Enzyme design. Structure first.
Site, PDB file in Angstrom:
ATOM      1  N   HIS A 133       0.664  -1.233   0.148  1.00  0.00           N
ATOM      2  CA  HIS A 133      -0.117  -0.105  -0.054  1.00  0.00           C
ATOM      3  C   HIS A 133       0.880   1.441  -0.065  1.00  0.00           C
ATOM      4  O   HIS A 133       0.811   1.978   0.931  1.00  0.00           O
ATOM      5  CB  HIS A 133      -1.003   0.061   1.220  1.00  0.00           C
TER       6      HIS A 133
ATOM      7  N   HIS B 175       1.588   1.564  -5.654  1.00  0.00           N
ATOM      8  CA  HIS B 175       0.150   1.266  -5.685  1.00  0.00           C
ATOM      9  C   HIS B 175      -0.653   2.265  -6.092  1.00  0.00           C
ATOM     10  O   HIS B 175      -1.462   2.039  -7.073  1.00  0.00           O
ATOM     11  CB  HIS B 175      -0.396   0.692  -4.295  1.00  0.00           C
TER      12      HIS B 175
ATOM     13  N   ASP C 234      -8.379  -0.794  -7.750  1.00  0.00           N
ATOM     14  CA  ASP C 234      -7.702  -1.240  -6.462  1.00  0.00           C
ATOM     15  C   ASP C 234      -7.014  -2.642  -6.635  1.00  0.00           C
ATOM     16  O   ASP C 234      -6.086  -2.814  -6.108  1.00  0.00           O
ATOM     17  CB  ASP C 234      -8.652  -0.979  -5.364  1.00  0.00           C
TER      18      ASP C 234
ATOM     19  N   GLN D 248      -5.397 -17.787  -2.915  1.00  0.00           N
ATOM     20  CA  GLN D 248      -5.576 -16.773  -4.085  1.00  0.00           C
ATOM     21  C   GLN D 248      -6.638 -17.466  -4.842  1.00  0.00           C
ATOM     22  O   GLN D 248      -7.387 -16.578  -5.648  1.00  0.00           O
ATOM     23  CB  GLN D 248      -3.945 -16.867  -4.788  1.00  0.00           C
TER      24      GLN D 248
ATOM     25  N   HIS E 189      -6.110   7.209  -2.688  1.00  0.00           N
ATOM     26  CA  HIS E 189      -7.002   6.303  -2.193  1.00  0.00           C
ATOM     27  C   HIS E 189      -6.442   5.749  -1.138  1.00  0.00           C
ATOM     28  O   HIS E 189      -7.161   5.136  -0.281  1.00  0.00           O
ATOM     29  CB  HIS E 189      -7.581   5.629  -3.079  1.00  0.00           C
ATOM     30  N   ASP E 190      -5.294   5.302  -0.722  1.00  0.00           N
ATOM     31  CA  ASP E 190      -4.448   4.818   0.124  1.00  0.00           C
ATOM     32  C   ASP E 190      -3.616   5.710   1.018  1.00  0.00           C
ATOM     33  O   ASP E 190      -2.613   5.248   1.464  1.00  0.00           O
ATOM     34  CB  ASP E 190      -3.692   3.542  -0.101  1.00  0.00           C
TER      35      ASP E 190
HETATM   36  C1  JLI Z   1      -7.801  -7.380  -0.812  1.00  0.00           C
HETATM   37  N1  JLI Z   1      -6.635  -7.850  -1.823  1.00  0.00           N
HETATM   38  N2  JLI Z   1      -6.448  -6.964  -2.653  1.00  0.00           N
HETATM   39  C2  JLI Z   1      -5.451  -7.757  -3.269  1.00  0.00           C
HETATM   40  C3  JLI Z   1      -5.413  -9.115  -2.919  1.00  0.00           C
HETATM   41  C4  JLI Z   1      -4.481 -10.144  -3.453  1.00  0.00           C
HETATM   42  O1  JLI Z   1      -4.660 -11.091  -2.802  1.00  0.00           O
HETATM   43  O2  JLI Z   1      -4.026  -9.879  -4.739  1.00  0.00           O
HETATM   44  C5  JLI Z   1      -6.445  -8.993  -1.888  1.00  0.00           C
HETATM   45  C6  JLI Z   1      -6.823 -10.336  -1.219  1.00  0.00           C
HETATM   46  O3  JLI Z   1      -7.671  -9.862  -0.290  1.00  0.00           O
HETATM   47  N3  JLI Z   1      -6.453 -11.445  -1.229  1.00  0.00           N
HETATM   48  C7  JLI Z   1      -6.742 -12.362  -0.480  1.00  0.00           C
HETATM   49  C8  JLI Z   1      -8.253 -12.507   0.080  1.00  0.00           C
HETATM   50  C9  JLI Z   1      -8.316 -13.813   0.415  1.00  0.00           C
HETATM   51  N4  JLI Z   1      -7.326 -14.623   0.815  1.00  0.00           N
HETATM   52  C10 JLI Z   1      -7.294 -15.751   1.485  1.00  0.00           C
HETATM   53  C11 JLI Z   1      -5.829 -16.546   1.490  1.00  0.00           C
HETATM   54  C12 JLI Z   1      -5.315 -17.442   2.086  1.00  0.00           C
HETATM   55  C13 JLI Z   1      -5.880 -18.367   2.906  1.00  0.00           C
HETATM   56  C14 JLI Z   1      -5.293 -19.237   3.513  1.00  0.00           C
HETATM   57  C15 JLI Z   1      -3.905 -19.493   3.464  1.00  0.00           C
HETATM   58  C16 JLI Z   1      -3.295 -18.742   2.960  1.00  0.00           C
HETATM   59  C17 JLI Z   1      -4.145 -17.578   1.971  1.00  0.00           C
HETATM   60  N5  JLI Z   1      -5.159 -15.393   0.822  1.00  0.00           N
HETATM   61  C18 JLI Z   1      -6.061 -14.508   0.438  1.00  0.00           C
HETATM   62  N6  JLI Z   1      -5.759 -13.207  -0.090  1.00  0.00           N
HETATM   63 MG    MG Z   2      -7.339   1.011   0.758  1.00  0.00          MG
HETATM   64 ZN    ZN Z   3      -5.455   0.260  -2.724  1.00  0.00          ZN
END
Ligand code: JLI
Ligand code: MG
Ligand code: ZN
Length: 314
Positions: A68, A72, A217, A269, A106-107
């Protein structure tokens, strides 16, 4: 006035494409943003002395965090540029002005921790702003920088126009609170499928702009795989830092933020592309058809994550 910013040929061609990466040279990012403002909005939209001053004040109030960060901010602004350039006639002169500024800002002053960690830490910002804690702060920070001497980039706007653009920027920044995205998309999904969606309806424009803000975003998932894969290292660096801090509070963190459960990243992911990203870019392509490359690139990266789990990649 007659001073036009030019990029090298590769940047000048690549920058129009959704999947453009702004590169590792920080000192070119401001000129990349000014180039995009001049082309999206006009060379007369902002006074170049004030813009450059605004841009460096915004830079200075981004912290040195893995994800962030200043990079970004300019990456999210570029996605917005790409969307606005491929949807030329559908947006007003104020909206183009405000949405690129909103994206840069925004951040502002992000510390690398979610709204939840702030609430559980009992941070002063969590007392001042009950919901969308950080996003209310990012807007607050934006207004502060706009109120600095020689930083008012909207000087030429009227009282009413000024209030409209600051209202565009406010809703746009609040909308990057992912917790609000889910309902925003579902409502846009229902309005598009019944034919009740109408871009002359302000409350509908607000929603469409909010979905554009989520899409920009998240645009890290819409880059070419080598860029998406390497960005993910920066995202999890913040998440695991936040997990460590949750464990210091005596709270077992969600797996997403547990560095001991990094083996579960590829599947994590996978979940995020299905639950958040694909839905987001799907509805956006439905409402704004020329934004299809974002969906295609997202779909491609989903497939690359599937290959990681299968063990075809590491
Ligand atoms: C908000 N935002 N903006 C960009 C991205 C991005 O990841 O590019 C994200 C993001 O919310 N990602 C997430 C969301 C849910 N997840 C659950 C796991 C997960 C679970 C269990 C074990 C290891 C990982 N990893 C995750 N990553
Ligand atoms: Mg933000
Ligand atoms: Zn952002």
């Amino acid at each position: 006035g007659l001073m036009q910013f030019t990029l090298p040929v590769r940047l000048c061609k690549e920058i129009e494409l959704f999947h453009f990466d702004i590169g590792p040279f920080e000192n070119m990012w401001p000129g990349i943003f000014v180039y995009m403002v001049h082309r999206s909005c006009g060379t007369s939209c902002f006074e170049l002395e004030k813009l450059c001053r605004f841009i460096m004040s915004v830079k200075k109030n981004y912290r040195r965090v893995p994800y962030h960060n200043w990079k970004h901010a300019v990456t999210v602004a570029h996605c917005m540029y790409a969307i606005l350039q491929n949807n030329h006639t559908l947006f007003t002169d104020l909206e183009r002005k405000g949405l690129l500024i909103a994206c840069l800002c925004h951040d502002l002053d992000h510390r690398g921790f979610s709204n939840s960690y702030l609430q559980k830490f009992d941070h002063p910002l969590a007392a001042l702003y009950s919901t969308s804690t950080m996003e209310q702060h990012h807007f607050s920070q934006t207004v502060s920088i706009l109120q600095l001497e020689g930083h008012n980039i909207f000087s030429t706007l009227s009282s009413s126009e000024y209030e409209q653009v600051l209202e565009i920027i406010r809703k746009a920044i609040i909308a990057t609170d992912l917790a609000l995205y889910f309902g925003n998309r579902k409502q846009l999904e229902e309005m598009y499928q019944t034919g009740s969606l109408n871009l002359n309806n302000q409350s509908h424009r607000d929603r469409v702009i909010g979905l554009m803000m989520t899409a920009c975003d998240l645009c890290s998932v819409t880059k070419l795989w080598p860029v998406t894969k390497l960005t993910a290292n920066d995202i999890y660096a913040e998440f695991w830092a936040e997990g460590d801090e949750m464990k210091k509070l005596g709270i077992q963190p969600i797996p997403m933020m547990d560095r001991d459960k990094k083996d579960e990243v590829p599947q994590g992911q996978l979940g995020f592309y299905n639950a958040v990203a694909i839905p987001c870019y799907t509805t956006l392509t439905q409402i704004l058809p020329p934004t299809e490359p974002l969906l295609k690139a997202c779909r491609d990266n989903l497939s690359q994550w599937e290959k990681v789990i299968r063990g075809e990649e590491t």
